Homo-oligomer: A and B are copies of this chain.
């Protein structure tokens, strides 16, 4: 996608040499923002092939407030395995905060529903926010939220959304995060009878790994293909009743996939 390749280039161009926690070197820039008009098309990167499958399951999984990888395993989705404990437990990660942020006073707050209420009964609110940064549980999480914070905005029957992503691997993860949230907004909107607006992506520490250079050049040499079109084949009674099959992407003709090993 144009915006993506631009980021790629910029980090190549301005990234400074930081080392990641593993010791693997990065090329990082701090602070970036990019907008995607959802009506323009579904932002799935085409300059390299990407697989929605595991993206969809994960989203559905977050929405259930599940933190164990059982559901993912049932569908043979293993992106969380690397982190899970002996029982498939990840700790109070995403799903948990989204749906049951715990209060000191004994409550479990469901921010997803809160948000839905706001969108329906107060679209003009400046606080339609969902946060996964629960300071008290950080220590129990397998990993701290990367996309830790998001806000919705309504204007002219168009729902928009800004995500704050504190840490980013431009090559491996970005693409996936973009599609994931864009998917969320489509569902959200369907459920509120609003048309999709923009998806704004904001990053903190945005980087490329030193061992992803060729693949970067390689990808940087390709030309973006037209964006595909997401189709929701059905309208559930709630945001929690979506099924893997309600989604279907049409018009996606990406260039070949590109593998990027990682260190350990």
**Chain A residues within 8 Å of B, Cβ to Cβ:** 16, 18-21, 28, 30-33, 35, 101-107, 109, 111, 124-127, 129, 131, 133-136, 144, 148-149, 151, 153, 155-156, 160, 162, 164, 166-167, 197-198, 200, 202, 204-205
Contacts and interface: CB of A to CB of B under 8 A. Distances in A.
Contacts of A125: 21
Contacts of A135: 101, 103, 109, 111, 131, 134
A205 B153 contact: yes
Contact of A200 (B31, B126, B129): B31
20 contacts: A16-B155, A20-B124, A21-B126, A30-B160, A30-B200, A101-B136, A102-B136, A103-B104, A104-B105, A107-B136, A109-B135, A109-B136, A126-B166, A126-B204, A126-B205, A127-B144, A129-B133, A131-B131, A134-B135, A151-B204
A107 B134 CA distance: 13
Copies in the complex: 2
A150 to B, nearest CB: 10
Contacts of A102: 104, 136
Contacts of A101: 135-136
Question: Considering residues A32, A126, A136, A148, which has the most beta carbons from chain B within 10 angstroms of its beta carbon?
Answer: A126
